[PDB]
């Protein structure tokens, strides 16, 4: 026989971890050439991109790779071993592991080769614009506006010149003083809210350095002009390019940057992107540290959008971005010209919350078509006197 697969039952009857004598499942490998040498269990959630017990990948004696449902041990996927180069001999697979970086099954052959096996291969939505400005829907919009802190920790590596919700202190290294790439990987694929970038500079700084930081979409592996490194990855930019002056404190020794963009949410709407790149360059027109070397300390933290009770929030969040006529109705609500009752201070407050939301998200638009921005700013300036009157004269604090 090629071996046996016995599915037993965990016993929690007493206070001591015991086992049950009766096996739930008995499986026989009729083929002698299919003798089991190594096995790996695949979590079922990978395929989500009697309750199912996941799938098992086993290497046979003859090199065949078998993927079987653990519930019934039925041969669902079969992969024959490859041919050794220059001959017809079987390059029999010996042991199999799972490579999460490539999302593949990495198996070793008899001849020392390594092979990878890959598994797997707007209309009709209810928008958040057409409905009127009732209190409940505005409350739902505000609940969609909220943010949540990412927990647990994440994975990110930095150039060695920096030494460690995380922080890193910078050492005076000029090996890569020009370019600095910080690579980050999301722990799980979920709704990306924004990222907070905190820095501390040198205490003896009298003039502000001309240094820029730009978020970038990390590229998936194959299966006034910006710096050449940013130009190489220009087509996949997702924030900025913003300079250092956008967030300096009064002292000049600290600062702040919130990195996000409408293009960011519009591109995560496909639900594929999971890793990002932070690109840092000093742009030019005692320790004479220039630009990147001038930074003293850096701290990074990443937030997420709050997961509400309304599903398919991707299209809802992309609605207002794609359809800008909503803002015009909102400025009408601001003017109190609309006849659908009198607008209360709570509804106006939520309207202003939505307006601050859209201004904040659109504050960093990388090469985006400003036609929507032009339309909302035109609707602003068209009713600017009325809105400032109703807010600063006919409204509370």
């Amino acid at each position: 026989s090629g071996g046996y697969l016995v599915l037993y039952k965990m016993n929690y009857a007493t206070r001591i971890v015991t086992l049950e004598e009766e096996p739930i499942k008995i499986q026989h490998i009729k083929d002698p050439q299919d003798t089991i040498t190594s096995l790996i269990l695949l979590p079922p959630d990978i395929l989500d991109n009697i309750s199912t017990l996941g799938h098992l990948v086993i290497t046979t004696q003859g090199g065949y790779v078998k993927i079987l449902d653990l519930s019934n041990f039925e041969i669902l996927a079969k992969v024959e071993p490859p041919k050794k180069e220059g001959t017809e001999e079987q390059d029999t697979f010996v042991s199999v592991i799972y490579c999460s970086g490539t999302d593949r099954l990495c198996a070793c052959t008899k001849g020392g080769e390594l092979h990878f096996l890959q598994i797997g291969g707007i209309s009709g939505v209810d928008l958040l614009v057409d409905q009127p400005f009732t209190l409940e829907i505005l409350t739902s919009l505000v609940e969609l506006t909220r943010f949540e802190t990412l927990t647990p920790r994440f994975s990110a590596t930095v150039p060695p010149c920096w030494v460690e919700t995380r922080t890193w202190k910078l050492q005076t290294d000029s090996n890569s003083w020009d370019e600095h790439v910080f690579e980050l990987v999301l722990p799980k694929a979920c709704m990306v809210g924004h990222v907070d970038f905190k820095f501390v500079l040198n205490s003896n700084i009298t003039n502000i350095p001309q240094i820029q930081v730009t978020l970038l979409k990390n590229k998936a592996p194959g299966l006034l002009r910006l710096c050449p490194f940013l130009e190489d990855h220009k087509e996949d930019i997702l924030c900025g390019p913003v300079w250092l002056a956008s967030g300096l404190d009064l002292s000049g020794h600290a600062g702040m940057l919130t990195l996000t963009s409408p293009k960011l949410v519009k591109g995560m709407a496909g639900g594929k992107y999971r890793s990002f790149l932070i690109h840092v360059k000093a742009v030019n027109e005692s320790e004479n540290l220039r630009g990147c070397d001038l930074l003293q300390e850096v701290s990074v933290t990443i937030r997420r959008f709050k997961k509400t009770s309304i599903s398919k929030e991707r299209v809802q969040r992309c609605a207002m971005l794609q359809f800008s006529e909503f803002h015009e109705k909102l400025v009408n609500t601001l003017c109190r010209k609309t006849d659908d009752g009198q607008i209360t201070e709570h509804a106006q407050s939520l309207v202003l919350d939505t307006l601050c939301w859209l201004a904040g998200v659109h504050s960093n638009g990388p090469g985006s078509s400003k036609e929507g921005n032009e339309n909302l700013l035109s609707k602003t300036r068209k009713f600017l006197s009325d809105i400032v009157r109703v807010c600063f004269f006919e409204a509370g604090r």
């Binding site: 010996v94 999460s100 390594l114 590596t157």
Partner: protein
């Protein structure tokens, strides 16, 4: 029928592969050859990061396994079982299965990173004068040759540079005296350089490698503790 897609192959070793291990923390394929050498391969480009012989006995049957719950790699040879975890992003697998020595004169293989070696060389050539220490010239020669060999691989690839290590096959007592001398010399000159934690870590590691060099922990009222040996965090806890 479940669908499986094939997209090519890469060549790991010419002697054949028997057992495998993947390290999720480093995206490193710790492929185990049938001759006992472990080839660490980067999981993002398909390039071998390093090759290690684990300092194990020749001809032994090694078996490498990875545990993601504890994030530790277990190597089981025919004689002894070792446990390893990543340090500064690299797995120090050169002495993964090294058997503990019984005497101070027994030669111990010592692995160090590139940056630690550079700091040690800079201190010993500019800021530390330990020429009176035993084995100092041999250690200096080994450090210089390792650094000049490692710099060539450092200038080419960064990941290969980080995975590259410097190996000193030196007696245990010689290494203890050199490390203690570096620590004392850096303490008397009151210079806070990166060579001091490296020397302290090296001396503590060598002490841990020798069961005969373990005075009892005297935790009791009215009794002082010898701070020089107590520098290890394990003693403090």
């Amino acid at each position: 029928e479940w669908l499986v897609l094939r997209d090519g192959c890469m060549h790991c070793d010419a002697d054949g592969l028997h057992s495998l291990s993947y390290h999720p923390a480093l995206n490193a394929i710790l492929a185990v050859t049938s001759r006992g050498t472990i080839k660490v391969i980067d999981g993002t480009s398909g390039a071998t990061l390093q090759a290690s012989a684990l300092s194990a006995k020749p001809g032994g049957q090694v078996k490498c396994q990875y545990i993601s719950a504890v994030d530790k790699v277990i190597f089981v040879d025919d004689y002894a079982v070792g446990c390893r975890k990543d340090l500064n992003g690299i797995l120090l697998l050169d002495t993964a299965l090294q058997t503990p020595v019984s005497k101070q004169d027994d030669v111990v293989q010592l692995e160090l990173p590139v940056t630690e070696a550079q700091q040690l060389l800079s201190a010993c050539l500019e800021k530390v004068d330990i020429s009176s220490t035993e084995g100092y010239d041999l250690f200096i020669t080994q450090l210089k040759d390792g650094l000049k060999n490692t710099s060539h691989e450092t200038a080419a690839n960064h990941k290969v540079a980080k995975w590259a290590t410097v190996t000193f096959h030196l007696p245990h007592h010689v290494l203890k005296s050199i490390a203690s001398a570096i620590v004392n010399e850096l303490k008397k000159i009151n210079q806070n350089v990166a060579a001091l934690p490296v020397a302290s870590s090296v001396m503590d590691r060598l002490s841990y490698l020798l069961p005969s060099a373990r005075p009892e922990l005297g935790v009791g009222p009215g009794r002082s503790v010898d701070r020089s040996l107590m520098y290890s965090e394990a003693n403090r806890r």
